[PDB]
Design a protein around this ligand. Structure first.
Ligand SMILES: CCCCCCCC/C=C\CCCCCCCC(=O)OC[C@H](O)CO
Ligand SMILES: CCCCCCCC/C=C\CCCCCCCC(=O)OC[C@H](O)CO
Ligand SMILES: *C\C=C(C)/C=C/C=C(C)/C=C/C1=C(C)CCCC1(C)C
Ligand SMILES: CCCCCCCC/C=C\CCCCCCCC(=O)O
Ligand SMILES: CCCCCCCC/C=C\CCCCCCCC(=O)O
Ligand SMILES: CCCCCCCC/C=C\CCCCCCCC(=O)O
Ligand SMILES: CCCCCCCC/C=C\CCCCCCCC(=O)O
Ligand SMILES: [Cl-]
Length: 265
């Protein structure tokens, strides 16, 4: 997993290396700061939607820990020798991000179905096919990135299969959204449409980072990839969670829940 990724192939100047480390540690503070927000505001959510904010708290920490682990692993592996940071130990890899995706993605999707006001049979059903679709996407994508150094052909083929799941996944998401927004309260039938387009954008940065080894196989591609993941993380997890929370609170007010009615006031 360490020799299979392109990061183990290049030396990095002090600028490139300190910039990556600063990206990873910044994502930590952003997520753990967001955690405190999602934690505090969960009281302003009616019980019907409160799980939606608790799932954001889980994502914030699941991502913050992996990011924090990525930073420490980033430093342990490289040592400044003769004007450039050089690989010293095989401990860094992007594979740990994919494991973070197996957990955060089901949490990001489940809280979307909760603000849409699904329940019972359809919730457990729609939730089962989206996760198995996301898992199939994450796994096929994990196998392909194991060849981002040896077999680029395999990366493409596995990337194609992973994209097949991605398309099917979003098709189910969009279908459920536009077939259930009329049920949403407080005027959130418009906000949920915006969250969807936020989804379609942020989630599409990952496959672009997945392909950086194919069109920019250099140290500046390693920096571009992490910069892409950083933009994607902050949008698919933080901003996405803020919109989900705003929707959760808004409907809580419309339903007559006072802590949300006084919070928005
Ligand atoms: C040889 C390797 C095997 C190739 C196979 C891997 C490719 C999978 C892609 C599409 C089919 C799977 C998706 C089919 C989804 C049908 C179920 C569904 O979508 O229903 C959900 C519903 O909208 C909510 O209740
Ligand atoms: C490896 C490449 C394989 C080929 C893949 C490339 C082709 C992509 C085509 C469509 C994307 C669909 C994205 C999902 C967009 C949301 C669709 C939706 O919301 O559902 C329709 C709705 O019911 C209407 O009102
Ligand atoms: C941290 C949050 C999320 C939603 C991570 C999401 C990742 C993806 C949607 C990755 C998608 C890929 C596809 C479409 C095909 C190439 C390989 C990937 C797994 C990177
Ligand atoms: C309520 C407080 C909100 C902010 C959360 C706490 C802020 C923590 C700040 C930095 C993250 C700590 C982990 C980064 C490690 C830095 C050293 C390294 O490069 O590995
Ligand atoms: C591969 C694993 C498939 C998982 C299937 C989906 C499981 C989702 C089950 C529900 C978890 C969230 C429960 C929150 C519901 C809130 C509504 C209520 O309070 O009754
Ligand atoms: C660690 C928990 C794993 C959970 C797996 C359950 C989800 C399975 C979904 C579809 C898997 C499709 C990927 C094909 C596997 C072959 C790739 C390989 O050889 O490693
Ligand atoms: C389930 C997905 C299986 C699709 C096969 C992936 C390609 C295998 C290969 O390139 O050798
Ligand atoms: Cl991530």
């Amino acid at each position: 997993n360490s020799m299979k990724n392109i990061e183990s192939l290049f030396d990095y100047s002090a600028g490139q290396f300190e910039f990556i480390d600063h990206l990873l540690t910044m994502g930590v503070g952003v997520h753990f700061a967001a955690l405190i927000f999602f934690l505090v505001v969960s009281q302003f959510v009616a019980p019907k939607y409160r799980i939606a904010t608790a799932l954001s708290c889980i994502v914030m920490v699941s991502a913050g820990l992996i990011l924090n682990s990525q930073a420490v692993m980033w430093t342990d592996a490289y040592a400044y020798v003769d004007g450039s940071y050089q690989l010293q130990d095989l401990t860094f890899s992007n594979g740990y991000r994919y494991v973070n995706w197996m957990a955060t993605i089901p949490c990001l999707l489940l809280q979307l179905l909760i603000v849409l006001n699904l329940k019972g049979k359809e919730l457990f059903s729609t939730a089962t096919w989206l996760i198995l679709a996301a898992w199939g996407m994450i796994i096929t994508g994990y196998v392909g990135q194991l060849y981002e150094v040896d077999d680029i052909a395999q990366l493409m083929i596995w990337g194609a299969v992973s994209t097949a799941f991605f398309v099917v996944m979003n098709w189910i998401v969009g279908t459920k959204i536009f077939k259930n927004r009329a049920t949403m309260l407080g005027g959130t039938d418009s906000t949920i449409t915006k969250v969807f387009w936020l989804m379609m954008f942020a989630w599409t940065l990952y496959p672009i980072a997945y392909l950086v080894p194919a069109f920019m196989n250099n140290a500046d591609g390693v920096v571009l990839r992490q910069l892409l993941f950083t933009i994607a993380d902050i949008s698919s997890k933080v901003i996405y969670g803020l919109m989900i929370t705003y929707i959760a609170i808004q409907q809580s007010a419309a339903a007559g829940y006072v802590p949300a009615q006084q919070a928005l006031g």
